[PDB]
Amino acid sequence: PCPGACVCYNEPKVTTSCPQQGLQAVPVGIPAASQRIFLHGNRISHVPAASFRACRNLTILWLHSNVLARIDAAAFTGLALLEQLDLSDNAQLRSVDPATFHGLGRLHTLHLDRCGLQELGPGLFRGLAALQYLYLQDNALQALPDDTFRDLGNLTHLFLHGNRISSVPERAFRGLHSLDRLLLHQNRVAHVHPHAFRDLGRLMTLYLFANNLSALPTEALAPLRALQYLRLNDNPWVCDCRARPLWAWLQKFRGSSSEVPCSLPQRLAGRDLKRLAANDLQGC
Ligand SMILES: *[C@H]1O[C@H](CO)[C@@H](O[C@H]2O[C@H](CO)[C@@H](O[C@H]3O[C@H](CO[C@H]4O[C@H](CO)[C@@H](O)[C@H](O)[C@@H]4O)[C@@H](O)[C@H](O)[C@@H]3O)[C@H](O)[C@H]2NC(C)=O)[C@H](O)[C@H]1NC(C)=O
Ligand SMILES: *[C@@H]1O[C@H](CO)[C@@H](O[C@H]2O[C@H](CO)[C@@H](O[C@@H]3O[C@H](CO)[C@@H](O)[C@H](O)[C@@H]3O)[C@H](O)[C@H]2NC(C)=O)[C@H](O)[C@H]1NC(C)=O
C-alpha cells in the first residue's frame, strides 16, 4: 500500500509523492516500483544508508527544501538508474561525504545549490559520466580543487555563481569537454591561471562578472574556440600596461562581450576597455 502522508499512482511513471507535509523521516514502505519519489518541502534532517535501496528503477528523487544536515555515505546505494537528484535548498547541509554519489552512472542532473557547501571533497563527482547539469551556486565554496570535474565528460552546464571562490587554478576545469555554460559570477575571483580553461573547447558562455579581477591572462581565453557570450563587467580592471593583451584579444573576439570598465587610472575610470585605442594605455 501507500505510506501515510503520501499519495501513490502508477502511470505514466510509478510515483510516490509525499511533499510539503512536514515529515521528519523518509516514509517507511515506499513502493519498491517507484520511478519518482517526491519528498521536497518537509523537515527531513538525515538520510540514512540505503533509504531507497529497494527502488531500483528510481529515476527522479526530490529532497530539496528540507533541513538536511547529514546524508549517509550509502544513502543512495542501489540507485544505478537515478537520473535526477535534487538536494537543493538544504542550507545547513554544509558537507557531503565524498563517496555519496559513487555509482550514480546514469545521473543527468544534480542540484546542490543553496546547501551551505563548504568544499568539494576528493572524488565527490567521480564516475558521474552521464552528468549534464551540475548546480552548485549559492553555497559557501571558496576553492576549486584540481580535477574535481574531470570525469564529467558530458557536462554542459556548471553553475558556481554566488560562492566565495577567489582563484581559478590550472586544473580546476580539466575534463569538461562538453561544457557549454560556465557561470562564475558573484564570487571573489582575483586570479585566473593562464591554462584554467584548457579543456573548454565547446564553451559558449562564460560569466565572470562581479568578481575581483584587475587583470586576466589572454592565454586563458585562447582555447575557447566556441566562445560566444562573455561577461567581464563589474571587476576592478586596471587599464595600464597589463590591459594591453586583453585589449587586443577583445579586438579579435567575434562573439558578444559585456563592457570591460577600467577602474584605474583615474584618466580612464569608467571607460570601457573595448572602446579604447591601444594609444590610450600606458606602455609596458
Ligand atoms: C522496474 O523495472 C521494470 C519496468 O520496466 C520492471 O520489469 C519487469 O516487470 C515484471 C516484474 O516481475 C516482469 O514480469 C512480469 O511480466 C512477465 C511477462 O513479460 C511481460 O512484460 C514484458 C516487458 O518487456 C513484455 O514483453 C510483455 O508485457 C510481457 O507480457 C510475466 O512473468 C508477468 O506478467 C510478470 O508480472 C517483467 O517481465 C519485467 N519487464 C521488463 C520490461 O523486463 C521491474 O519489475 C521494475 N522493478 C521493480 C522490482 O519494481
Ligand atoms: C555521453 O554522451 C555521449 C554522446 O551523446 C553518449 O554516447 C553514446 O550515446 C548513445 C547511448 O549509448 C549511443 O547510441 C548507440 O548508437 C549505436 C550506433 O552507433 C548503437 O549501439 C545504438 O543505436 C545505441 O543507441 C551513441 O552511439 C554514443 N555516442 C557516441 C557517438 O559516442 C554517452 O553514452 C554519454 N555518457 C553517459 C555515461 O551517459
What this model shows, in words?
Its main location: membrane. This protein has 284 residues and is mostly beta strands. The chain has one domain (1-284): Ribonuclease Inhibitor (Leucine-rich repeat, LRR (right-handed beta-alpha superhelix), Alpha-Beta Horseshoe). 5% of the residues lie in helices and 17% in strands. It has 2 helices and 18 strands. Strands 1-2-3-5-7-8-9-10-12-14-15-17 form a 12-stranded mixed beta sheet, with no helix packed on it. Helix 1 links the parallel strand 14 and strand 15 (229-231). The site of a molecule of 4 linked components (NAG-NDG-MAN-MAN) has 4 residues, from loops.
Q: Helix-strand pattern, N to C? A: EEEEEEEEEEEEEEHEEHEE
- Number of extended strands: 18
Contiguous helical run count: 2
- Would you tell me the structural class of the helices and strands? mainly beta
**What is the name of the CATH superfamily?**
Ribonuclease Inhibitor
Oligomer: monomer
The CATH topology turns out to be Leucine-rich repeat, LRR (right-handed beta-alpha superhelix)
- Characterize the main sheet: 12 strands, mixed
Number of domains: 1
Helical proportion, percent range? under 10%
What is the CATH C level class, in words?
Alpha Beta
Strand arrangement in the largest pleated sheet = 1-2-3-5-7-8-9-10-12-14-15-17
Shape: elongated
User: What is the CATH architecture term?
Assistant: Alpha-Beta Horseshoe
What is the distance, rounded to the nearest whole angstrom, between the alpha carbons of the first and last residues?
A: 76 Å
Percent in strands: 15-25%
Bound molecules: a molecule of 4 linked components (NAG-NDG-MAN-MAN), a molecule of 3 linked components (NAG-NDG-BMA)
**CA-atom Rg in angstroms:** 22 Å
PDB class: signaling protein
Keywords: MAD, Myelination Inhibition, Omgp, MAG, p75, Signal Transduction, Neuronal Regeneration, Ligand Binding
Assembly: monomeric
Entry title: 1.5A Crystal Structure of the Nogo Receptor Ligand Binding Domain Reveals a Convergent Recognition Scaffold Mediating Inhibition of Myelination
